[PDB]
C-alpha cells in the first residue's frame, strides 16, 4: 500500500502478513467460489500492482485457476498496449507512461507504479486497473468451478422459498450470461423451478411479481 | 475514517482492507440476516459517507438487497432535501450546506463530508445520518429474507423452553410490526406457541409473567 | 386487391370468396396458433386495408382474440397520428394524407387507400402497414393461447431428438422474450431438457454445438 | 410470374395469395420433410427470383432452416460471381449482366430479372437458377430434420414387405450419400433389414433381384 510522507512524496508500506494470510485462507476454503471475487477486492483495496502480484504468489499452488487469471491479464494488457500506445519518444529525466505490463507490475518497480498512481498531472490508477483485470480472471474461475447450474437449482418439496431463492441467486452470480437472460431467469425460471405449492401462490400474485412480493407471499408455504 | 492532525485540521484515513473484508464475510455468511444490521453499524463506526459507499460497493453482487438499500437511501435523502432546504444563495468562499445526496457522498468529496462532520459552527454528522438510512435499508432486507415468521415458531415437544425463546425473539427482531404488537406477541403468542407442559407451567405462573420468571419456571421442563 | 387498367389508373378487385374461406378455416382449426400469423400474411398479400377488415370480419366470432388485435391496431395508429402528424392545411382538390385510422380503412374509402398505395409522388403502403399492425395483434394472440411453455417442453425418454427439437422451436416461436434470451434457450435450455442419453452425446459434442451438429449426433439415440 | 403483353414485352403478375398460402401450409405440416423439396419446385414454377424471396419470407419464422437455405444461396452466388465474372465495362443504355446476387433478386428489380429471363439474345434463366440453389438448401434441411436413418429402418415382424420398402426408400431420399452407396443400400441393406421370413424368400430369388421381383415375391409373406 502507499502512505504519504513529509515533502508531498509517497512511499510503499508492505501488505500486512495477516492481510495476505486472510487472502490465502479464503482461496483455500471457498475454492474460487463467487465470494472470492469480492473477498479479493476488499483485501486488495489501495494496493499497488506489486502487492497484488504477492497475493497471487501466495495462492500460486492453485495452478489451473492461476493459469486462467494469467491468460486474462495478458489480454487486458495487450488491449491497453493497443488503445493506450506509447505516445512517442519519451523525454529524458521523465518516467515512461505505463504499458499493460507496467499496470501488472511485472516490468515495473513499485515506485514507478506509485509515481503514476499519484502523478500530479495525468495520474494512472495502475493498482485498480490490474485489480479489475484479476476480477475478470477470478470471475471466469468462479464460473468454471461453479458446482450447480442456475437451471438445475429446483426448490425442495419442504425447502423454504427463501433458501431456494438463496441457492437460485448464488448460481446466477456465477452465470456470465447477458443481463437480459439474467432478468428473464429471475422473473420466469425462479417461478418455473419452485415446489408445486409455492408455484401456485406465485402465479396467484399475478404478472411480474417483485422478489420482495414473492418472498412475502411464500413465507411459511410448505 | 478521520484522524485529526497538527493545526486543528482533519484528514481521511482509508477504511482498513480487513475492516472491509470482515463486512464482506458477514454479508456472504449471514445472508442479510438480523445480525448484519448491527454488524454493519460496528464496522461503519466513525466512517465518512465515502467509506460507507465502498463497504456497499464491496457487497454490490447481492443486487436485490442493494436495490432495496438504494431505494431507501433516495427517499431518506428526498426527505432531507425537503425539510433541510437550501438556506438560500450561499456566500462565495464557503462550503455549500449538505443535501440528501451530499449526506450519501455521491455528489460530494470526502473532504466536504469531513468539513461538515467537524464544522466549528453547525457540524452536520453526514456519516451517521447515512448509516441510519442504510440501517433502514438493511432492516427491510432482514425482513424480506427472514426464513421463519414469528407466528410459525412453535416449541418442539422436547425443545428446552430457552431455545424456543431464542428462536421466538430472533424472528421478532425481523418483525417491523408496531411496538404494541411486539409487546403482545412476547406476552401472549410466546405462551400460546409452547409445548403442552411448558404451557401449563406458564399459565401456572399467573398473569403477566416476566421473561426471567418464565425461563426460570420452565428450566428442565420436558 | 388492386389491378391496373388502361389510362394508368388502378381499380379494386374484391378478395376471392375462397381466399376469404381459407382464412376462416385456418383461424377455426389452428385456433390462433403460431401458423396463423404467416397464414394471415400470405392470404393478405397485395390487399388494401378495406380487404383486411373483411378477413377480420369473417373471423369476428373469436371475440377475445379480435379485442386483442383491435387494441394493438388503435395503438399502432395513435403512434402513426403522433409521428406522422397532419402536415398542415391540405390544399383543395387534393386527397388528405393518411392517418392511423385511414391506414386501417375505418375512416377511409378503398379508392383513397389505392390512391395512397399508388401515389405517383409519396406512395404510402397503407395495406402493408395495417397487415404489420394485425401481425403484432395475432402474435400476441399466439402467445396468449400457446398451450406449452418453452421451459415445460422436455424430450420423452424414447422421443427422437428431432421431434423434441420440433416441439422446442414451436414454443419458442410463441415466446416474445428478448432475442438474446431466445439464443440462450436454443443453446442451453435445449441441451438441459433432453432425455438422459441425448444429454450425454450433446455434452460430448463440446461447447456451442450448432443445431445441425446436435441433430446429426442424436439421430437414432434412444 | 410473367405474362406476355402486346408489343412483344413482358410484365410481372404477383404470385396468387393461395399459391403462397399452400407453400406456408406445406412447410408448417411437413416440417421441411423430403416432400417439401418437390412441393417448393411445383409452387415456384415460372417464378421470378423476386417471387421466390416472398415464398421464403412467408416461411421465415423457421429461422434455423432459413439460415441453412441462406448460407447455401450465398455460396451458389459466389460460385456464379467467380465462373460468370463481370464481362468488362458494360456499355451505357444496356442492362448489366446478372451476378449471383441478381439471380437471387436481392440486388435486382423484378423487371431486370424479367429482361434477363426473356433476353432476345443470351437469356439468363435467373428464376430457375435460384430455385435450384434453394432446392440444395431445402435438401440439406430435409437431411438435418430426417427423423429415421436408412440403417435404423428394419421391417416389423408383421409389417408387409411393401410398407417396409416405403419407409426404406423415404429415408434414402433424405440420404445425401454417393449414388453407388444408394445402389448398394437398395440391393444389400434392404434384404439385410427385412423380417426373418421375407429375408429367406429374397435370398431364395437369387442374386440381384429387382425391386418389382422382391415386392411380387414377398406380397402376403407374414
Ligand atoms: O472477530 P474477532 O473476535 O476479532 O476474530 C478475528 C476475526 O476472525 P473471526 O471473526 O472469523 O473469528 C478476524 O477476521 P475479521 O472478521 O475481523 O475480518 C481474523 O482476522 P483475519 O482477517 O486475518 O481473518 C482474526 O483471525 P487471526 O488472528 O488468525 O488473523 C480473528 O482474531 P482472533 O482469532 O485472534 O480472535
Ligand atoms: O391440392 P388440391 O388437390 O388442389 O386441393 C385443394 C387444396 O386443398 P388441400 O390440398 O388441403 O386438399 C387447396 O388448398 P391449397 O393447398 O391449394 O392451397 C384448397 O383451396 P383453399 O386454399 O381454399 O384451401 C382446395 O379446397 P377448396 O376447393 O375447398 O377451396 C382444394 O381443392 P379440392 O378440395 O376441390 O380438391
PDB file of C-alpha atoms in Angstrom, chain D residues 10-220:
ATOM      1  CA  UNK D  10     -43.402  -8.950 -70.680  1.00  0.00           C
ATOM      2  CA  UNK D  11     -44.847  -7.816 -67.277  1.00  0.00           C
ATOM      3  CA  UNK D  12     -44.953  -9.277 -63.725  1.00  0.00           C
ATOM      4  CA  UNK D  13     -48.131 -10.847 -62.232  1.00  0.00           C
ATOM      5  CA  UNK D  14     -47.803 -11.273 -58.407  1.00  0.00           C
ATOM      6  CA  UNK D  15     -47.873 -14.936 -57.133  1.00  0.00           C
ATOM      7  CA  UNK D  16     -51.515 -15.735 -56.042  1.00  0.00           C
ATOM      8  CA  UNK D  17     -52.123 -15.392 -52.246  1.00  0.00           C
ATOM      9  CA  UNK D  18     -53.421 -19.030 -52.170  1.00  0.00           C
ATOM     10  CA  UNK D  19     -50.298 -20.182 -54.155  1.00  0.00           C
ATOM     11  CA  UNK D  20     -48.259 -18.544 -51.311  1.00  0.00           C
ATOM     12  CA  UNK D  21     -50.605 -19.963 -48.589  1.00  0.00           C
ATOM     13  CA  UNK D  22     -50.210 -23.549 -49.959  1.00  0.00           C
ATOM     14  CA  UNK D  23     -46.400 -23.139 -49.619  1.00  0.00           C
ATOM     15  CA  UNK D  24     -46.813 -21.922 -45.980  1.00  0.00           C
ATOM     16  CA  UNK D  25     -49.160 -24.859 -45.116  1.00  0.00           C
ATOM     17  CA  UNK D  26     -46.708 -27.441 -46.587  1.00  0.00           C
ATOM     18  CA  UNK D  27     -43.691 -26.022 -44.632  1.00  0.00           C
ATOM     19  CA  UNK D  28     -45.868 -25.900 -41.419  1.00  0.00           C
ATOM     20  CA  UNK D  29     -47.112 -29.537 -41.751  1.00  0.00           C
ATOM     21  CA  UNK D  30     -44.238 -31.491 -43.446  1.00  0.00           C
ATOM     22  CA  UNK D  31     -41.624 -29.676 -41.294  1.00  0.00           C
ATOM     23  CA  UNK D  32     -39.013 -29.450 -44.136  1.00  0.00           C
ATOM     24  CA  UNK D  33     -39.688 -33.159 -44.890  1.00  0.00           C
ATOM     25  CA  UNK D  34     -38.414 -34.731 -48.176  1.00  0.00           C
ATOM     26  CA  UNK D  35     -41.834 -33.782 -49.780  1.00  0.00           C
ATOM     27  CA  UNK D  36     -41.124 -30.036 -49.213  1.00  0.00           C
ATOM     28  CA  UNK D  37     -38.326 -30.071 -51.858  1.00  0.00           C
ATOM     29  CA  UNK D  38     -40.704 -31.142 -54.736  1.00  0.00           C
ATOM     30  CA  UNK D  39     -43.577 -29.102 -53.200  1.00  0.00           C
ATOM     31  CA  UNK D  40     -41.402 -25.934 -53.404  1.00  0.00           C
ATOM     32  CA  UNK D  41     -40.460 -26.675 -57.071  1.00  0.00           C
ATOM     33  CA  UNK D  42     -44.113 -27.130 -58.227  1.00  0.00           C
ATOM     34  CA  UNK D  43     -45.297 -23.952 -56.368  1.00  0.00           C
ATOM     35  CA  UNK D  44     -42.246 -21.907 -57.639  1.00  0.00           C
ATOM     36  CA  UNK D  45     -42.559 -22.952 -61.347  1.00  0.00           C
ATOM     37  CA  UNK D  46     -42.413 -19.944 -63.742  1.00  0.00           C
ATOM     38  CA  UNK D  47     -41.465 -17.604 -60.800  1.00  0.00           C
ATOM     39  CA  UNK D  48     -39.011 -14.656 -60.967  1.00  0.00           C
ATOM     40  CA  UNK D  49     -36.366 -14.517 -58.163  1.00  0.00           C
ATOM     41  CA  UNK D  50     -38.496 -11.693 -56.575  1.00  0.00           C
ATOM     42  CA  UNK D  51     -41.437 -14.154 -56.041  1.00  0.00           C
ATOM     43  CA  UNK D  52     -39.167 -16.922 -54.636  1.00  0.00           C
ATOM     44  CA  UNK D  53     -37.950 -14.380 -51.983  1.00  0.00           C
ATOM     45  CA  UNK D  54     -41.616 -13.743 -50.919  1.00  0.00           C
ATOM     46  CA  UNK D  55     -42.300 -17.508 -50.606  1.00  0.00           C
ATOM     47  CA  UNK D  56     -39.203 -17.690 -48.307  1.00  0.00           C
ATOM     48  CA  UNK D  57     -40.354 -14.507 -46.496  1.00  0.00           C
ATOM     49  CA  UNK D  58     -43.717 -16.246 -45.813  1.00  0.00           C
ATOM     50  CA  UNK D  59     -41.792 -19.127 -44.028  1.00  0.00           C
ATOM     51  CA  UNK D  60     -39.039 -17.007 -42.304  1.00  0.00           C
ATOM     52  CA  UNK D  61     -40.195 -17.933 -38.736  1.00  0.00           C
ATOM     53  CA  UNK D  62     -38.494 -21.350 -39.372  1.00  0.00           C
ATOM     54  CA  UNK D  63     -35.219 -19.414 -38.713  1.00  0.00           C
ATOM     55  CA  UNK D  64     -32.847 -22.444 -38.370  1.00  0.00           C
ATOM     56  CA  UNK D  65     -33.808 -23.889 -41.815  1.00  0.00           C
ATOM     57  CA  UNK D  66     -33.870 -20.362 -43.377  1.00  0.00           C
ATOM     58  CA  UNK D  67     -30.280 -19.802 -42.112  1.00  0.00           C
ATOM     59  CA  UNK D  68     -29.248 -23.076 -43.908  1.00  0.00           C
ATOM     60  CA  UNK D  69     -31.087 -22.097 -47.175  1.00  0.00           C
ATOM     61  CA  UNK D  70     -29.410 -18.620 -46.873  1.00  0.00           C
ATOM     62  CA  UNK D  71     -25.823 -19.971 -46.427  1.00  0.00           C
ATOM     63  CA  UNK D  72     -26.324 -22.309 -49.479  1.00  0.00           C
ATOM     64  CA  UNK D  73     -27.657 -19.364 -51.634  1.00  0.00           C
ATOM     65  CA  UNK D  74     -24.607 -17.096 -50.839  1.00  0.00           C
ATOM     66  CA  UNK D  75     -22.170 -19.909 -51.843  1.00  0.00           C
ATOM     67  CA  UNK D  76     -24.012 -20.795 -55.106  1.00  0.00           C
ATOM     68  CA  UNK D  77     -23.952 -16.999 -55.881  1.00  0.00           C
ATOM     69  CA  UNK D  78     -20.193 -16.649 -55.065  1.00  0.00           C
ATOM     70  CA  UNK D  79     -19.522 -19.576 -57.465  1.00  0.00           C
ATOM     71  CA  UNK D  80     -21.640 -17.676 -60.081  1.00  0.00           C
ATOM     72  CA  UNK D  81     -19.619 -14.458 -59.385  1.00  0.00           C
ATOM     73  CA  UNK D  82     -16.352 -16.451 -59.972  1.00  0.00           C
ATOM     74  CA  UNK D  83     -17.272 -18.575 -63.068  1.00  0.00           C
ATOM     75  CA  UNK D  84     -19.572 -15.903 -64.634  1.00  0.00           C
ATOM     76  CA  UNK D  85     -17.419 -12.786 -63.899  1.00  0.00           C
ATOM     77  CA  UNK D  86     -18.403  -9.223 -64.988  1.00  0.00           C
ATOM     78  CA  UNK D  87     -17.599  -9.446 -68.757  1.00  0.00           C
ATOM     79  CA  UNK D  88     -15.976  -5.966 -68.552  1.00  0.00           C
ATOM     80  CA  UNK D  89     -17.104  -2.274 -68.765  1.00  0.00           C
ATOM     81  CA  UNK D  90     -20.848  -2.544 -69.645  1.00  0.00           C
ATOM     82  CA  UNK D  91     -21.991  -0.103 -72.421  1.00  0.00           C
ATOM     83  CA  UNK D  92     -24.398   2.717 -71.374  1.00  0.00           C
ATOM     84  CA  UNK D  93     -28.141   2.256 -72.105  1.00  0.00           C
ATOM     85  CA  UNK D  94     -27.775  -1.518 -71.509  1.00  0.00           C
ATOM     86  CA  UNK D  95     -28.841  -3.768 -68.573  1.00  0.00           C
ATOM     87  CA  UNK D  96     -25.818  -5.141 -66.634  1.00  0.00           C
ATOM     88  CA  UNK D  97     -25.436  -8.972 -66.873  1.00  0.00           C
ATOM     89  CA  UNK D  98     -26.731 -10.884 -63.792  1.00  0.00           C
ATOM     90  CA  UNK D  99     -24.398 -11.608 -60.786  1.00  0.00           C
ATOM     91  CA  UNK D 100     -25.105 -14.311 -58.109  1.00  0.00           C
ATOM     92  CA  UNK D 101     -26.943 -11.560 -56.073  1.00  0.00           C
ATOM     93  CA  UNK D 102     -29.081 -10.538 -59.141  1.00  0.00           C
ATOM     94  CA  UNK D 103     -30.050 -14.244 -59.667  1.00  0.00           C
ATOM     95  CA  UNK D 104     -31.313 -14.177 -56.032  1.00  0.00           C
ATOM     96  CA  UNK D 105     -33.242 -10.879 -56.649  1.00  0.00           C
ATOM     97  CA  UNK D 106     -31.708  -9.133 -53.557  1.00  0.00           C
ATOM     98  CA  UNK D 107     -29.726  -6.512 -55.586  1.00  0.00           C
ATOM     99  CA  UNK D 108     -32.018  -6.502 -58.652  1.00  0.00           C
ATOM    100  CA  UNK D 109     -35.546  -5.364 -59.680  1.00  0.00           C
ATOM    101  CA  UNK D 110     -38.113  -7.966 -60.921  1.00  0.00           C
ATOM    102  CA  UNK D 111     -38.090  -6.133 -64.314  1.00  0.00           C
ATOM    103  CA  UNK D 112     -34.307  -6.738 -64.623  1.00  0.00           C
ATOM    104  CA  UNK D 113     -34.943 -10.409 -63.693  1.00  0.00           C
ATOM    105  CA  UNK D 114     -37.658 -10.494 -66.461  1.00  0.00           C
ATOM    106  CA  UNK D 115     -35.393  -8.718 -69.035  1.00  0.00           C
ATOM    107  CA  UNK D 116     -32.719 -11.444 -68.477  1.00  0.00           C
ATOM    108  CA  UNK D 117     -35.251 -14.333 -68.257  1.00  0.00           C
ATOM    109  CA  UNK D 118     -36.575 -13.198 -71.704  1.00  0.00           C
ATOM    110  CA  UNK D 119     -33.474 -11.598 -73.328  1.00  0.00           C
ATOM    111  CA  UNK D 120     -33.805 -11.847 -77.154  1.00  0.00           C
ATOM    112  CA  UNK D 121     -30.015 -12.549 -77.238  1.00  0.00           C
ATOM    113  CA  UNK D 122     -28.493 -14.513 -74.285  1.00  0.00           C
ATOM    114  CA  UNK D 123     -31.476 -15.079 -71.935  1.00  0.00           C
ATOM    115  CA  UNK D 124     -30.338 -15.969 -68.350  1.00  0.00           C
ATOM    116  CA  UNK D 125     -32.968 -18.109 -66.513  1.00  0.00           C
ATOM    117  CA  UNK D 126     -32.432 -16.345 -63.114  1.00  0.00           C
ATOM    118  CA  UNK D 127     -35.681 -17.808 -61.659  1.00  0.00           C
ATOM    119  CA  UNK D 128     -34.680 -21.460 -62.312  1.00  0.00           C
ATOM    120  CA  UNK D 129     -31.003 -20.995 -61.152  1.00  0.00           C
ATOM    121  CA  UNK D 130     -32.253 -19.525 -57.797  1.00  0.00           C
ATOM    122  CA  UNK D 131     -34.891 -22.332 -57.409  1.00  0.00           C
ATOM    123  CA  UNK D 132     -32.003 -24.849 -57.911  1.00  0.00           C
ATOM    124  CA  UNK D 133     -29.907 -23.049 -55.195  1.00  0.00           C
ATOM    125  CA  UNK D 134     -32.903 -23.140 -52.738  1.00  0.00           C
ATOM    126  CA  UNK D 135     -33.517 -26.849 -53.536  1.00  0.00           C
ATOM    127  CA  UNK D 136     -29.886 -27.523 -52.432  1.00  0.00           C
ATOM    128  CA  UNK D 137     -30.756 -25.556 -49.220  1.00  0.00           C
ATOM    129  CA  UNK D 138     -34.105 -27.396 -48.622  1.00  0.00           C
ATOM    130  CA  UNK D 139     -32.485 -30.825 -49.331  1.00  0.00           C
ATOM    131  CA  UNK D 140     -29.855 -30.022 -46.657  1.00  0.00           C
ATOM    132  CA  UNK D 141     -32.844 -29.135 -44.328  1.00  0.00           C
ATOM    133  CA  UNK D 142     -34.584 -32.490 -45.265  1.00  0.00           C
ATOM    134  CA  UNK D 143     -31.384 -34.377 -44.216  1.00  0.00           C
ATOM    135  CA  UNK D 144     -30.907 -32.326 -40.963  1.00  0.00           C
ATOM    136  CA  UNK D 145     -34.563 -32.908 -39.817  1.00  0.00           C
ATOM    137  CA  UNK D 146     -34.811 -36.517 -41.173  1.00  0.00           C
ATOM    138  CA  UNK D 147     -36.313 -38.483 -38.203  1.00  0.00           C
ATOM    139  CA  UNK D 148     -35.163 -42.079 -39.130  1.00  0.00           C
ATOM    140  CA  UNK D 149     -31.778 -43.044 -40.685  1.00  0.00           C
ATOM    141  CA  UNK D 150     -31.743 -45.538 -43.633  1.00  0.00           C
ATOM    142  CA  UNK D 151     -29.780 -48.069 -41.459  1.00  0.00           C
ATOM    143  CA  UNK D 152     -32.247 -47.955 -38.486  1.00  0.00           C
ATOM    144  CA  UNK D 153     -35.272 -48.770 -40.745  1.00  0.00           C
ATOM    145  CA  UNK D 154     -35.987 -52.522 -40.085  1.00  0.00           C
ATOM    146  CA  UNK D 155     -39.149 -54.414 -41.263  1.00  0.00           C
ATOM    147  CA  UNK D 156     -41.602 -55.190 -38.421  1.00  0.00           C
ATOM    148  CA  UNK D 157     -42.242 -58.935 -37.826  1.00  0.00           C
ATOM    149  CA  UNK D 158     -45.810 -58.480 -39.235  1.00  0.00           C
ATOM    150  CA  UNK D 159     -45.158 -55.323 -41.332  1.00  0.00           C
ATOM    151  CA  UNK D 160     -45.986 -56.043 -45.041  1.00  0.00           C
ATOM    152  CA  UNK D 161     -42.731 -56.035 -47.139  1.00  0.00           C
ATOM    153  CA  UNK D 162     -44.061 -53.046 -49.264  1.00  0.00           C
ATOM    154  CA  UNK D 163     -44.567 -50.730 -46.204  1.00  0.00           C
ATOM    155  CA  UNK D 164     -41.018 -51.636 -45.031  1.00  0.00           C
ATOM    156  CA  UNK D 165     -39.945 -50.811 -48.675  1.00  0.00           C
ATOM    157  CA  UNK D 166     -41.934 -47.493 -48.404  1.00  0.00           C
ATOM    158  CA  UNK D 167     -40.096 -46.415 -45.185  1.00  0.00           C
ATOM    159  CA  UNK D 168     -36.692 -47.688 -46.525  1.00  0.00           C
ATOM    160  CA  UNK D 169     -36.918 -45.542 -49.730  1.00  0.00           C
ATOM    161  CA  UNK D 170     -38.293 -42.426 -47.906  1.00  0.00           C
ATOM    162  CA  UNK D 171     -35.128 -42.301 -45.670  1.00  0.00           C
ATOM    163  CA  UNK D 172     -32.940 -42.946 -48.759  1.00  0.00           C
ATOM    164  CA  UNK D 173     -34.498 -39.748 -50.297  1.00  0.00           C
ATOM    165  CA  UNK D 174     -33.018 -37.795 -47.302  1.00  0.00           C
ATOM    166  CA  UNK D 175     -29.602 -39.585 -47.654  1.00  0.00           C
ATOM    167  CA  UNK D 176     -27.036 -37.306 -49.438  1.00  0.00           C
ATOM    168  CA  UNK D 177     -24.552 -40.262 -49.790  1.00  0.00           C
ATOM    169  CA  UNK D 178     -22.805 -41.099 -53.133  1.00  0.00           C
ATOM    170  CA  UNK D 179     -25.172 -42.751 -55.725  1.00  0.00           C
ATOM    171  CA  UNK D 180     -23.223 -46.084 -55.570  1.00  0.00           C
ATOM    172  CA  UNK D 181     -23.830 -46.177 -51.763  1.00  0.00           C
ATOM    173  CA  UNK D 182     -27.539 -45.592 -52.671  1.00  0.00           C
ATOM    174  CA  UNK D 183     -27.457 -48.514 -55.196  1.00  0.00           C
ATOM    175  CA  UNK D 184     -25.670 -50.858 -52.680  1.00  0.00           C
ATOM    176  CA  UNK D 185     -28.212 -49.967 -49.893  1.00  0.00           C
ATOM    177  CA  UNK D 186     -31.233 -50.711 -52.167  1.00  0.00           C
ATOM    178  CA  UNK D 187     -29.648 -54.052 -53.289  1.00  0.00           C
ATOM    179  CA  UNK D 188     -27.968 -55.233 -49.991  1.00  0.00           C
ATOM    180  CA  UNK D 189     -29.273 -53.270 -46.900  1.00  0.00           C
ATOM    181  CA  UNK D 190     -32.976 -53.703 -47.979  1.00  0.00           C
ATOM    182  CA  UNK D 191     -32.601 -57.563 -47.931  1.00  0.00           C
ATOM    183  CA  UNK D 192     -30.383 -57.335 -44.759  1.00  0.00           C
ATOM    184  CA  UNK D 193     -33.009 -55.405 -42.685  1.00  0.00           C
ATOM    185  CA  UNK D 194     -36.145 -57.493 -43.556  1.00  0.00           C
ATOM    186  CA  UNK D 195     -38.072 -59.704 -41.037  1.00  0.00           C
ATOM    187  CA  UNK D 196     -36.730 -63.334 -40.869  1.00  0.00           C
ATOM    188  CA  UNK D 197     -39.206 -64.900 -43.372  1.00  0.00           C
ATOM    189  CA  UNK D 198     -39.061 -62.181 -46.086  1.00  0.00           C
ATOM    190  CA  UNK D 199     -35.215 -62.437 -45.821  1.00  0.00           C
ATOM    191  CA  UNK D 200     -35.442 -66.202 -46.748  1.00  0.00           C
ATOM    192  CA  UNK D 201     -37.728 -65.549 -49.810  1.00  0.00           C
ATOM    193  CA  UNK D 202     -35.456 -62.675 -51.052  1.00  0.00           C
ATOM    194  CA  UNK D 203     -32.298 -64.910 -50.759  1.00  0.00           C
ATOM    195  CA  UNK D 204     -34.459 -67.578 -52.500  1.00  0.00           C
ATOM    196  CA  UNK D 205     -34.995 -65.217 -55.502  1.00  0.00           C
ATOM    197  CA  UNK D 206     -31.210 -65.334 -56.185  1.00  0.00           C
ATOM    198  CA  UNK D 207     -28.533 -62.656 -56.964  1.00  0.00           C
ATOM    199  CA  UNK D 208     -29.546 -59.018 -57.885  1.00  0.00           C
ATOM    200  CA  UNK D 209     -33.369 -59.370 -57.537  1.00  0.00           C
ATOM    201  CA  UNK D 210     -35.124 -56.201 -58.961  1.00  0.00           C
ATOM    202  CA  UNK D 211     -37.491 -54.298 -56.567  1.00  0.00           C
ATOM    203  CA  UNK D 212     -40.558 -55.424 -58.639  1.00  0.00           C
ATOM    204  CA  UNK D 213     -39.407 -59.107 -58.279  1.00  0.00           C
ATOM    205  CA  UNK D 214     -38.861 -58.619 -54.492  1.00  0.00           C
ATOM    206  CA  UNK D 215     -42.270 -56.865 -53.926  1.00  0.00           C
ATOM    207  CA  UNK D 216     -44.036 -59.583 -56.042  1.00  0.00           C
ATOM    208  CA  UNK D 217     -42.269 -62.413 -54.107  1.00  0.00           C
ATOM    209  CA  UNK D 218     -42.921 -61.035 -50.553  1.00  0.00           C
ATOM    210  CA  UNK D 219     -46.591 -59.989 -51.139  1.00  0.00           C
ATOM    211  CA  UNK D 220     -48.560 -61.756 -48.343  1.00  0.00           C
TER     212      UNK D 220
END
